[PDB]
Design a protein around this nucleic acid. Structure first.
Ligand SMILES: [Mg+2]
Ligand SMILES: [Mg+2]
Ligand SMILES: [Mg+2]
Ligand SMILES: [Mg+2]
Ligand SMILES: [Mg+2]
Ligand SMILES: [Mg+2]
Ligand SMILES: [Mg+2]
Ligand SMILES: [Mg+2]
Ligand SMILES: [Mg+2]
Ligand SMILES: [Mg+2]
Ligand SMILES: [Mg+2]
Ligand SMILES: [Mg+2]
Ligand SMILES: [Mg+2]
Ligand SMILES: [Mg+2]
Ligand SMILES: [Mg+2]
Ligand SMILES: [Mg+2]
Ligand SMILES: [Mg+2]
Ligand SMILES: [Mg+2]
Ligand SMILES: [Mg+2]
Ligand SMILES: [Mg+2]
Ligand SMILES: [Zn+2]
Ligand SMILES: [Zn+2]
Lengths: 63, 81, 129, 25, 151, 225, 102
RNA sequence: CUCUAACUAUAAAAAUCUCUCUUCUC
RNA sequence: GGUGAAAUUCUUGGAUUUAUUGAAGACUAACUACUGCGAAAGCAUUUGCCAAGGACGUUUUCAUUAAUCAAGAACGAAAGUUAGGGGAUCGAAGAUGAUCAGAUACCGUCGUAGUCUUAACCAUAAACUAUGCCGACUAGGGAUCGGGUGGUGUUUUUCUUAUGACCCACUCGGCACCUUACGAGAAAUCAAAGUCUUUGGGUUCUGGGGGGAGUAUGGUCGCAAGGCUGAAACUUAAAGGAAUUG
């Protein structure tokens, strides 16, 4: 079942957009953590973005 | 896949495939120049050697037969040919 | 140890007429052999839990008169080439042994399991029923 | 009938005929 | 991937390099290589072991690349080619070994079947070498006479 | 029930008045040397009981002899040989596992390797020893099985056989049992085959016994007290 | 017609395996076709765990388990409820019945 | 975005069955 | 004991169970799996000896020696047949005790031949993947066994390393498996049963409705059992395959 009040409330909750940013490195002191491979991707793309190399420790968890 | 070069495939794909299965079939083996600590003679050996190769000057083996390629001795130093 | 005079319960529970047979540590001396068919009428319920229950009460009373206060359970199935799965009555026998004052130590299963059977009875097509 | 038992009955008929022939061979 | 006398389907082999001429890095002389081949043959070695020795201890990729002739051809030019070709000789050696094993224990039937296979292979190879006149036309493999050739 | 065709083809007494209790004394290689009591007929002049006692084999859990529970799954058989009167002495007769542990470690998706060796100890006691080992899944093995090739199995069997021969011919079953209690042979066998294959659950089970040289009283009494 | 592409045996490349006997009816059945069920259970069930715990020396005695691999027949397996007839599109599934308890 | 634990345990006996089948074209 | 339940049978000359042991013969549990080897039957305790074999590696050697195969040959499960050996278990015949209307059938207890072997026969099985062999190509996904390559990989410990054992990637070969039809089929289904009316890579064997009939006869093999080869007269409108609804 649905009605005008519930649908309006759902739409109002849907229109919620945070004023603060959840992207563009607002967190982690304007640093994103990427491994070497995607760093070479950024390099070969011809683009200079603020990166932070970190090895991914190719040893896999035994699960 | 539908359209694709076979005359010029990537060299990575060349090393990927099996021997006898490249465009032109070429061996993956190679020869080596080994020096034994004993003398200064340079001995030419095969990667996949099948015999206990020794320098003619000294009765010291430089390779060891193995199911695949040669396992060299401990202190012999080699350069790829 | 506080001088717990020990025996071995040594239960043998086939698919019919379970056995409760307590002996000393050596096992060379047999006391209180009373079985399941010893105490029940129908001749078909010798394997029944009640059979082993009464047999267990009798062996407990006899051993308590003897002086043995704690027992070692040695559960045995019919074993050999047979089914070798424990009988229905043996568990009730063990429970009734543990009920009647006796102390319990080192339960073991001692069913005779072969490195192989000589030949299992029944023919190639087995019991057809 | 099964083919097995028809075959066996044929074999028994051959039994009788073979002994008859052997007695008169 | 045929395996004439079994169900095998392997293709384990060696790929001869495209360039027929001598490798650039090889410094030895063709005459020296032929002398080495002759000496190895005089030691009492079949051509296959000669090729193995020249490939392992020396830079000889293969004789035909360096000299221009094959190992058996080089031996034949100097008259050291064995009267029985090497592969057929090894087949007779294997056959006599299996026959010895059989006559020392009768009940092994699998080795009996393997002996049958080896004898069939021997017959095929003998037929080939006979149609090329390497062997005399009267040459044949017989169980009793194989030992003398092997011994 | 109570049915019997009486196909027989009061003089009743209680057979416990003519009976009594002896005590089982363990070798000094074990801690809790007071094992238990054994029921015996009363002594008769024509047939002395002490003759009847000797040869008895009592079966006791190993943990009941050392107090700890690390030896819960083992089991030791002691042989009655010398009776001191109202107390008798027992010598080692054999060793075994409990079927519970044995089935607990015989699990699927791993190869069990068994080693069998019949040897002679430092004395003339002749023993037979069985060792059982199980290949171990590596601490990184994403592959789910843990099988071992036949070559590895044969090598492991050879190593275990030579180790058991070494540690039997170099000691007596007094010292050999004192070695068996802290299962140092298990650790040594595991370490000697560490390169060949992981080998989880290296155990020595069912230490049999096939012969006794003579009746040596001196060490038997020396083994007690 | 083929009711089972696997033919039920699960052999695929042996020709012959050594038969094993049924636990119930003692039917000589091949070891791969025979249904094997690993009965691992408690030597004393929960009906008497409290009783044994109260009436046992060796405080905190870890009671032993009992292990038996049962080699059922196949008529027995249908009849003894061990295995059940399945839908023709359900016969595809070979995974065990989804972890009876977690 | 990290995970392998709980469980049993039924087989008594029951054989056989005389008809008759009928059209789809808007 | 045994059973649905009973009975036959053994037992105070003390059976059933209880501990040590001893003898015999068989067999190789658990490990044992959509795992391995083999030409197919088949092969599962350890160790040694004997020879053999697939797969992989090979800048080794010969150069068409090859594929399939009438005639001919080697092995060929179980059962069975001659003799000699053994003789535990289980068990054709048989002996009984039950169930039934009958039960010389199924349930039960004994039980010869046989099962186990050394020689000599036998040559048949639902000897099944009911799919002949060799060769090429066509589609995605993981695993698994044997081998071989590389990792600046991980634990290993013999200070470091070398192995081994894993981890990741690739490749060759094998028993296999999941998905799918874009192909094939009467469909069930098949990654071959595809590349077949858009019909031709090489090659061997077999079938022409059902029954009579794998019968008779004639050969041939076998001591025998029986094997291989193998019709017709006549009769019949169906027999049969897959699937759908009841
Ligand atoms: Mg039924
Ligand atoms: Mg059907
Ligand atoms: Mg199945
Ligand atoms: Mg195969
Ligand atoms: Mg008795
Ligand atoms: Mg085994
Ligand atoms: Mg295997
Ligand atoms: Mg033919
Ligand atoms: Mg036979
Ligand atoms: Mg005989
Ligand atoms: Mg009868
Ligand atoms: Mg009757
Ligand atoms: Mg019967
Ligand atoms: Mg019998
Ligand atoms: Mg046939
Ligand atoms: Mg066929
Ligand atoms: Mg016809
Ligand atoms: Mg027909
Ligand atoms: Mg004839
Ligand atoms: Mg149909
Ligand atoms: Zn030198
Ligand atoms: Zn069954």
């Amino acid at each position: 079942i649905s009605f005008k009040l519930q649908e309006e409330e759902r739409e109002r909750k849907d229109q919620y957009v945070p004023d603060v940013s959840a992207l563009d490195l607002s967190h982690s002191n304007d640093v994103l953590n990427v491994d070497t491979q995607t760093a070479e991707l950024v390099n070969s793309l011809g683009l200079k973005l603020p990166l932070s190399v970190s090895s991914v420790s190719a040893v896999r968890d035994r699960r | 896949v539908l359209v694709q070069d076979l005359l010029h495939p990537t060299a990575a794909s060349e090393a990927r495939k099996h021997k006898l299965k490249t465009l032109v079939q070429s061996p993956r083996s190679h020869f080596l120049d080994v020096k034994c600590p004993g003398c200064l003679n340079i001995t030419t050996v095969f990667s996949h050697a099948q015999t206990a190769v020794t320098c003619e000057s000294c009765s010291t083996v430089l390779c060891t037969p193995t199911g695949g390629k040669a396992k060299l001795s401990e202190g012999t130093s080699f350069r790829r040919k | 140890d506080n001088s717990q005079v020990f025996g071995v319960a040594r239960i043998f529970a086939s698919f019919n007429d379970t056995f409760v047979h307590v002996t000393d540590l050596s096992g060379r001396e047999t006391i209180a052999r009373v079985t399941g068919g010893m105490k029940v009428k129908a001749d078909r319920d010798e394997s029944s839990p009640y059979a082993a229950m009464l047999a267990a009460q009798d062996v407990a009373a006899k051993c308590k008169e003897v002086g043995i206060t704690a027992v070692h359970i040695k559960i045995r199935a019919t074993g050999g080439t047979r089914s070798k799965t424990p009988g229905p009555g043996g568990q009730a026998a063990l429970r009734a042994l543990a009920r009647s004052g006796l102390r319990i130590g080192r339960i073991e299963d001692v069913t005779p399991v072969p490195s192989d059977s000589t030949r299992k009875k029944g023919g190639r097509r087995g019991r057809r029923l | 009938m099964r083919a097995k038992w028809r075959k066996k009955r044929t074999r028994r008929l051959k039994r009788k005929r073979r002994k008859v022939r052997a007695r008169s061979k | 991937m045929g395996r004439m006398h079994s169900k095998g389907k392997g293709m384990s082999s060696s790929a001869i390099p495209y360039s027929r001429n001598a490798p650039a890095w090889f410094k030895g002389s063709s005459d020296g290589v032929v002398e080495q081949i002759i000496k190895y043959a005089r030691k009492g070695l079949t051509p296959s072991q000669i090729g193995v020795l020249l490939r392992d201890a020396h830079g000889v990729t293969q004789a035909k690349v360096i000299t221009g002739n094959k190992i058996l051809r080089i031996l034949k030019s100097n008259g050291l080619a064995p009267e029985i070709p090497e592969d057929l000789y090894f087949l007779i050696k294997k056959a006599v070994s299996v026959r010895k094993h059989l006559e020392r224990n009768r009940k092994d039937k699998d080795a009996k079947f393997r002996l049958i296979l080896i004898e069939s292979r021997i017959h095929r190879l003998a037929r080939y070498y006979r149609t090329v006149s390497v062997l005399p036309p009267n040459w044949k493999y017989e169980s009793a006479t194989a030992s003398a050739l092997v011994n | 029930a109570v049915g019997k065709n009486k196909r027989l083809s009061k003089r009743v007494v209680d057979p416990f008045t003519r009976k009594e209790w002896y005590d089982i004394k363990a070798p000094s290689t074990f801690e809790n040397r007071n094992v238990g009591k054994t029921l015996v007929n009363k002594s008769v002049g024509l047939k002395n009981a002490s003759d009847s006692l000797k040869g008895r084999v009592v079966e006791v859990c190993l943990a009941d002899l050392q107090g700890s529970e690390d030896h819960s799954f083992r089991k030791v058989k002691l042989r009655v040989d010398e009776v001191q009167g109202k107390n008798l002495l027992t010598n080692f007769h054999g060793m075994d596992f409990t079927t519970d542990k044995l089935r607990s470690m015989v699990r699927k998706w791993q190869t069990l390797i068994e080693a069998n060796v019949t040897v002679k100890t430092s004395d003339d006691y002749v023993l037979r020893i069985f060792a059982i080992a199980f290949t171990r899944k590596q601490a990184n093995q994403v592959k789910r099985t843990s099988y071992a090739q036949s070559s590895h199995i044969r090598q492991i069997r050879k190593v275990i056989s030579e180790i058991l021969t070494r540690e039997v011919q170099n000691s007596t079953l007094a010292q050999l049992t004192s070695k068996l209690i802290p299962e140092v042979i298990n650790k040594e066998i595991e370490n000697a085959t560490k390169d060949i294959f992981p080998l989880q659950n290296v155990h020595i089970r069912k230490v049999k016994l096939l012969k006794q040289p003579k009746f040596d009283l001196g060490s038997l009494l020396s083994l007690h007290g | 017609p083929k009711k089972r592409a696997s033919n039920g045996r699960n052999k695929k490349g042996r020709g012959h395996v050594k038969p094993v006997r049924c636990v119930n009816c003692s039917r000589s059945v091949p070891k791969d076709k025979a249904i094997k069920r690993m009965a691992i259970r408690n030597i004393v069930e929960a009906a008497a765990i409290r009783d044994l715990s109260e009436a046992s020396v060796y405080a905190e005695y870890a009671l032993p388990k009992t292990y038996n691999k049962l080699h059922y027949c196949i008529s027995c397996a249908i009849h003894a409820r061990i295995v059940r007839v399945r839908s023709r599109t359900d016969r595809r599934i070979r995974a065990p019945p989804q972890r009876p308890r977690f």
